[PDB]
Amino acid sequence: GTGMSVPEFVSDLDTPDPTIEVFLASTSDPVIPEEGAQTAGEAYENVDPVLADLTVENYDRLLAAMRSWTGIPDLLEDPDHYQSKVAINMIQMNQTINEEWA
């Protein structure tokens, strides 16, 4: 009797957000670190936030993900481009969003 309800067409309810499928085609399962695995900092010259990560996790995070989610094909290749400097901050901001705003 209140009139409190939300109306929607059923052709619209059956149409998913069209980017859900793009995500599922760019995602992979984590690789569990082994005993004394070699990290990314002992294989290249990188930045502190992404340095204690392993080589395989470095590979999936960087290319398979960050360079496809933001369509920047050469992200984090030159350590002096402004895009790398802002992406390093965006990594920490994305971590704090998930950690302190649960």
SS3 59: helix
How many CB atoms sit inside 10 A of residue 57's CB? 18
Taking the CA atoms of 70, 73, 77 and 81 in sequence, report the sign of the dihedral they define.
negative
- What residues numbered 41-100 form the site for other proteins, per CB under 8 A? 52-53, 57, 61, 65, 82, 85-86, 89, 91-99
The span of 15-23, 36-44, 70-78 binding other proteins (CB under 8 A) equals 15-23
- Is 83 within any annotated ligand binding site? yes
Binding of other proteins by 25 (CB under 8 A): no
Q: What contacts 69, CB < 8 A, 6 or more positions away?
A: 26
**Which residue ranges make up the site for other proteins (CB under 8 A)?**
1-9, 12-14, 16-17, 19-20, 23, 27-30, 32-33, 52-53, 57, 61, 65, 82, 85-86, 89, 91-99, 101
